[PDB]
Amino acid sequence: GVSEFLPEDWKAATLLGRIDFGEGPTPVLVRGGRVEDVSKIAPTVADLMNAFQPGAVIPRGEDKGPLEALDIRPVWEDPDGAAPVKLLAPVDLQCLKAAGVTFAVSTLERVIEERARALKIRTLLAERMGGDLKSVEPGSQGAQRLKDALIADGLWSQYLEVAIGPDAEIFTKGPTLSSMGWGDQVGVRYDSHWNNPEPEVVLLCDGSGLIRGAALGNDVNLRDFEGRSALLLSKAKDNNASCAIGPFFRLFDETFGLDDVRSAEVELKITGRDNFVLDGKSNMSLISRDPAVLAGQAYGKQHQYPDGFALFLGTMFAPIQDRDTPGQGFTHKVGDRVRVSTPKLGVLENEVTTCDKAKPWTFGISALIRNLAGRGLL
């Protein structure tokens, strides 16, 4: 069932992704429900977005027929890759960037509720800032007053700095071409004991720093590493198969735009072999920094991205549901299936294993170059 991970109105949508039809990764546009191989128009997704700015007509690629007729199978049904067609992550040459601590209200309230083990705390804090904590504006003067009041209470932390300060937390999620897509295995380090998915929306940005579309993401996260030291953030975020993006980027058009991202309800479901089930659901409406503002902090006068970039927008999901150890929260088991979904983008589903058991990352930039050159696409 291919149709089950697509947006509800996907035949009216413009989807952009990558498919291996048997000869290597191929940029595809899905329009009118039909797949177009656009590799002769541009050999990569990054190249396509740079060749056709917003507002430009993208010509038609080679007809590959209806999308739901392609024999696409996920890894948990097709371990050996018997399928004649493989769906890939919809990024290729883009840098993989991620924002974190973008939902500042829940960060603040979790700090307060940890201190309370609350009314008096929220009262004095809101009066120093000059308004309700639910209205905190990161990087504002009210946020500076809140910062100082929190330093005075002994509640300040480096996480609150990126929650309400002028600079958002933005980091490199993984190397270019290393992302997993729909139906792939994702990896948690074998030496991580406390880890979780992070259900997110991922923006697609072109080499001019313009937002072009959005996909779902799983920012696989190793809590025990980051908890020992924030300087292990990279090691908690960037390992073999630790990034999943997909199934397609949905491009902005008459049917879909950034305002639909701004109000998207993102759902998470984790299903284990042990019959564990976890559900979580969170609205992008509560994000404390606008997606365009986050993109503008990643890209501007002081950082460019000539091949474009993808940007995870962060999450307010908290992995506090106990699984097997009371008090310590969630952690993955091998074989967990993780679904991240939202109606306008479809469903990103992956299966969890450890980083050493997932297939190694072998198809890098040089591998792509040789593949594209051998096909005459350059």
Ligand X SMILES: O=P([O-])(O)O
Over the window 18 to 37, marking each residue x when it contacts ligand X by CB under 6 A and - when it does not, the resulting string is --------------------
Q: CA 222 to CA 195: how far, in whole Å?
A: 4
Among 32, 81, 306, 343, binds a second copy (CB under 8 A): 306
The CB-nearest residue to ligand X is 100
Q: CA 250 to CA 213: how far, in whole Å?
A: 5
Strand partners, 249: 16
Range 10-49, binding a second copy (CB under 8 A): 44, 46-47
Considering CB distances under 5 to 8 angstroms, the limit depending on partner class, which of a second copy, ligand NH4, ligand X, none binds residue 125? none
Residue 251 identity: L
What sign for the dihedral angle of Cα 232, 238, 241, 242?
A: positive
Q: How many other C-beta atoms lie within 10 A of the C-beta of residue 259?
A: 10
Structure letter (DSSP) for residue 291: H
Radius of gyration of the chain (CA): 21
Q: Does the protein bind a second copy through residue 176 (CB under 8 A)? A: yes
Strand partners, 116: none
Q: Which residue stretch of 116-124, 161-169, 324-332, 333-341 sits at the interface with ligand X (rule: CB under 6 A)?
A: 161-169
Q: Could you write out the DSSP letters of every residue in 222-234? A: EHHHHHH-GGGHH
Q: CA 49 to CA 93: how far, in whole Å?
A: 11
Q: Does the protein bind ligand X through residue 97 (CB under 6 A)? A: no
292: helix, coil or strand? helix
Contact 201, 232 (CB under 8 A): no
Considering CB distances under 5 to 8 angstroms, the limit depending on partner class, which of ligand X, a second copy, ligand NH4, none binds residue 312? ligand X
Query: Residue ranges of the alpha helices (H) in 42-87?
Result: 45-51
Among 59, 79, 227, 300, binds ligand X (CB under 6 A): 300
Per-residue burial over 227-252, b = 16 or more CB atoms within 10 Å of its CB, e = otherwise = eeeeeebeebbbbbbbbbbbbbbbbb
Closest separation in Å from C-beta 350 to ligand X: 15
Range 32-91, binding ligand NH4 (CB under 6 A): 52, 58
Q: Does the protein bind ligand X through residue 98 (CB under 6 A)? A: yes
Q: Does the protein bind ligand NH4 through residue 204 (CB under 6 A)? A: no
Closest separation in Å from C-beta 212 to ligand NH4: 6
Strand partners, 218: 199, 244
Q: Does the protein bind ligand X through residue 50 (CB under 6 A)? A: no
Scanning the structure block, which residue is given the tokens 């097997």?
324
Structure tokens at 279: 């559900």
Q: Cα–Cα–Cα angle for 370, 372, 374, nearest 5°?
A: 65
Nearer to ligand NH4, 139 or 272 (CB): 139
Closest separation in Å from C-beta 210 to ligand X: 7
> How many binding residues for a second copy (CB under 8 A)?
59
Nearer to ligand NH4, 130 or 300 (CB): 300
Which of 292, 252, 205 is closest to 56 using CA atoms? 252
Q: How many other C-beta atoms lie within 10 A of the C-beta of residue 21?
A: 16
Q: Does the protein bind a second copy through residue 161 (CB under 8 A)? A: yes
Among 171, 208, 262, 276, binds a second copy (CB under 8 A): 171
Closest separation in Å from C-beta 52 to ligand NH4: 6
**What residues make contact with a second copy under the rule CB under 8 A?**
44, 46-47, 50, 93, 95, 100-101, 117, 158-159, 161-162, 165, 167, 169-172, 175-176, 187, 189-190, 207, 225, 228-235, 238-240, 301-307, 355-356, 360-367, 369-370, 372-373, 378
**What residues make contact with ligand X under the rule CB under 6 A?**
54, 98-101, 106, 110, 166-167, 169, 191, 198, 200, 212-213, 219, 221, 226, 231, 251-253, 297, 300, 312, 314-315
**What residues make contact with ligand NH4 under the rule CB under 6 A?**
52, 58, 100-101, 106, 212, 251, 297, 300, 302, 314-315
